[model samples]
Target: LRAELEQRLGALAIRTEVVEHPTIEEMMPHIQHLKGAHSKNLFLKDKKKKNYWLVTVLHDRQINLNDLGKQLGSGNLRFADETAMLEKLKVGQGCATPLSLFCDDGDVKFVLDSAFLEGGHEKVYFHPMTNAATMGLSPEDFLIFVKATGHDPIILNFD
Candidate 1:
């Protein structure tokens, strides 16, 4: 699964720096040295479970669902449970990322932080297909990757 996604990036001429840590903490050793927005990928669903959103935001930022509800036009949002996670994106817990939308299965919406894009970083970090590996690529290429997932990302200024 991971290999296929990496290949897709290469095919698109998007050079990626695959950080070996897979786990969220594995990359901490160099976190202070990276040159882009550090990201935290959140997979959430509305109370009805009919809508899914992958919200990628600046690292360490607090998320307010009340505010998100006001902006996203959805009823109470909650993190997707294991069943929803596996069934929709085929990923568990920390494994969810913008790239996992390759498994899109026609159900997930991608939400990205406009602030992160304008954060003056040359590259952004994301878990490629799984949290087992990390992907570092230009924000422009990240947009292309998101579109390639068959969905247009809804860019918001939640910063």
Candidate 2:
């Protein structure tokens, strides 16, 4: 799967880092070492519908669901069920990333923190196909990967 993703994103100049961790939280220490903004993302859906969204923000950022739902224009937003996460993101619990936009049929929307764009470090990191590994790439390159998959990301605030 990573091979196919790498091929699809070959046009972008990026570095792929693969690391091992016993759990997603274990990644925090390494992220600190990487020295860039890192996030814990959720690929979610409204419980009653098929709508999907990608929410990425700093790991310590506060998230308010009601405000987020208002901004998203979805009546309500909740952490998607485990089945939804697995089926749609193609990842198990704890392996979420904006990369999952690759699995979307252009139906998933992205909501990124504006702050994620305001730094000198252009790279963002996330789990590649497992909680045990991570990949880092410039936001520009990540955008290319998202666009290549035909997803139009909607940048917004959820708080």
Candidate 3:
């Protein structure tokens, strides 16, 4: 999973560092110690099931799906199921990220927190297309990669 991501990034001339950790808890104590803004991902979809979303935000920030829906104009969002994650997003549970769009079937939307982007964090961390490893890259590089994937993520602020 990690190598595949490296290969993709390499194609874009983007170099990254992926740190391996056994669990989310184990990785938390060390994020500040790393050179990046650690993030948490939420796989969501509209209640009507017409659209899917991959929301990435600061790991420490609180996320309210209803508020997020209102902010995103997505209207009544719910967590996407394993089936949706697998069939539509092409990633299993625990593998959703802004980067997940790379494997999407063109129906998935990438969402990023405006605050996370504006904070001026240099490197940002995300679960590569899987959770076993955490991939870190510069914020600008991450955005570049997103564009390369043909996804223009909805950037918004949610409370």
Candidate 4:
């Protein structure tokens, strides 16, 4: 899947760093060595609506769904099931990354944490279509890639 993504994004010059992670939490130690800001992302969708959101935040921050929903103007937000994650994000359990935006079928939207973008980090780290590998790219370039895919991300502050 990573190879396919690389092929599709051949013009982006994305560099991938493959790693072994038993869980998304474990990827933090490895990201410490990579150049960029690291974040925990969640891909969610309304159970009965077409709205989709890509949420990214610092690893240490606490995420409360009720509070987040109010901020997002969604009333309430629920984590979509594994089926939705796979069908919409095209990723498995531990492999949910902002990169999933590439697979969005024009039905999903992006919600990024403002802190992650304001941290002055040039590059950002994410799984390369799989949790077993890590990929890094310039934050600006990532925005370009997402835009190329027709996704205009909404920036949110979890703090």
lDDT of 4 by residue, 1-159 (tens): 677777766766655554555565565776567666777877666655667677777766788887787786555688877787777777778655666667775777877777766777776777877876677777777777777777887876655
Model 3 TM-score (2 dp):
0.83
The TM-score leader among the candidates is 1
> What are the models' TM-scores?
0.85, 0.80, 0.83, 0.79
How accurate locally, in lDDT, is each candidate? 0.76, 0.70, 0.76, 0.71
- Residue-level lDDT for 121 in candidate 1: 84
Clashing pairs in 2: none
Tens digits of per-residue lDDT for model 2, 103-122: 77866787777666666775
Clashing pairs in 1: 22-132
- Model 2 scores worst on lDDT over the 10 consecutive residues at 11-20
Per-residue lDDT of candidate 3, residues 1-159 (tens digit): 556667888999998877776666666766656776777778887877578777888888887777778776644888878888887666786664666677774777788887666776677887777777777888888888887888887777755
Decide which is better by lDDT, 2 or 4.
4
Q: What is the C-alpha RMSD of each candidate to the true structure, in Å?
A: 3.0, 3.5, 3.1, 3.7
- lDDT of prediction 1: 0.76
Across 1-159, the per-residue lDDT of candidate 1 in tens digits comes to 778787887887788887666255645775755667777778778876568777888887788876776688644887778787787776777564777788775688888889766867888887766756667888888888788878898898863
